[PDB]
Write a protein that binds this ligand. Structure first.
Ligand code: FUM
Ligand code: FE
Length: 339
């Protein structure tokens, strides 16, 4: 009963029926509990953010002008820039840090193109029945056209600037534009920055796990190209390699046009564009977190321990002269000593 997932789907204004239905949600092995949906003016929402717990805000007006966005308007106005477009064989996009692909030898799609090229490929695949999937993920730069600049100016900067300030966060590092095909899945990973995830078109189911479920989610090695992503395939979890995935409990919600999901720093998130829900548009706002206090306050937060583990992996990579030695050394350290 408390495993309520995203709950019974919302009704759209003017009796236009449910936004989505449970048939559009993929099916997974683990329980989940709802993320709260609150007004930005609600004290509890501020309490959640202050505490680095996720909340969905319903009424920020953060990206009000972008609500008109759709492929036709974007292609008319987004300029002649190149757009990074990731490709995939299945719904599951796994992403690669390319600087890290030298680290690792035994290793194996990004493509740059114009917006019109992107739309045409979707258009093609659509009327040709192909299985290929595409995800545009491009940070918004200055090539963008007159009307996009204008929309962007009309974002609710008063609100978000106030948050950055209330929270002591660092700088806004980027806005990423994401345009996905229905069914697209970004698998469980974590980011080291604070995120406002501003939904614009279509619906996305967001499954979050707290930083203290690191032991259940089995992130790739730091020097691996898939740094920060879970090794576990949620569709076919290998419980022999990943036994504690049997203990994983998530927080979930479905976001649509106008909702903002606060994804706290180091929270795992798994993001899926609803099946048969059409194309999805989202813009993220990433901020560096607050600086680390004084010296330290113990107990120590889960995300500080994650930070400790990343740094040990990184330093041992420098010291050994070879990221591949990390694992063999780590094992020599614990076997028969700490396990
Ligand atoms: O919306 C996505 O597909 C991914 C978002 C993220 O990783 O923040
Ligand atoms: Fe992310």
């Amino acid at each position: 009963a408390v495993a309520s997932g995203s709950g019974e789907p919302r009704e759209e204004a003017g009796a236009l029926g449910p936004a989505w239905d449970e048939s559009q949600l993929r099916s997974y092995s683990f329980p989940t509990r709802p993320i709260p949906r609150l007004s930005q003016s609600d004290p509890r929402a501020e309490e959640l953010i202050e505490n680095e717990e996720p909340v969905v805000l319903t009424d920020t007006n953060l990206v009000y002008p972008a609500l008109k966005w759709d492929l036709e308007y974007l292609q008319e106005n987004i300029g002649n820039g190149d757009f990074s477009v990731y490709s995939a064989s299945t719904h599951k996009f796994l992403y690669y840090d390319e600087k890290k692909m030298a680290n690792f030898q035994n290793f194996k799609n990004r493509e740059e193109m114009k917006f019109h090229e992107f739309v045409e490929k979707l258009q093609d695949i659509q009327q040709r029945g192909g299985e290929e999937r595409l995800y545009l993920q491009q940070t918004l730069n200055d090539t963008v056209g007159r009307k996009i600049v204008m929309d962007f100016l009309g974002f609710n900067w008063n609100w978000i600037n106030k948050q950055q300030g209330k929270r002591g966060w660092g700088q806004l590092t980027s806005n990423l534009l994401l345009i996905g095909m229905e069914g697209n899945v970004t698998p469980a990973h974590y980011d080291e920055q604070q995120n406002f995830f501003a939904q614009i078109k279509g619906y996305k189911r967001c499954i979050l796990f707290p930083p203290d479920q690191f032991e259940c989610l089995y992130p790739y090695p730091v020097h691996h190209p898939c740094d920060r992503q879970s090794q576990v395939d949620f569709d076919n979890p290998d419980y022999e390699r990943f036994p504690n995935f049997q203990n994983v409990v998530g927080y979930e919600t479905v976001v649509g046009p106008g909702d903002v999901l606060y994804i706290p720093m180091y929270w795992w998130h798994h993001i899926e564009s609803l099946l048969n829900g059409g194309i999805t548009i989202t813009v993220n706002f990433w901020y560096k977190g607050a600086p680390t206090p004084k010296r330290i306050e113990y107990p120590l937060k889960a995300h500080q321990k994650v930070a400790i583990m990343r740094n040990i992996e990184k330093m041992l990579g420098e010291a050994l002269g070879n990221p591949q030695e990390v694992g063999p050394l780590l094992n020599t350290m614990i076997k028969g000593r700490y396990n």
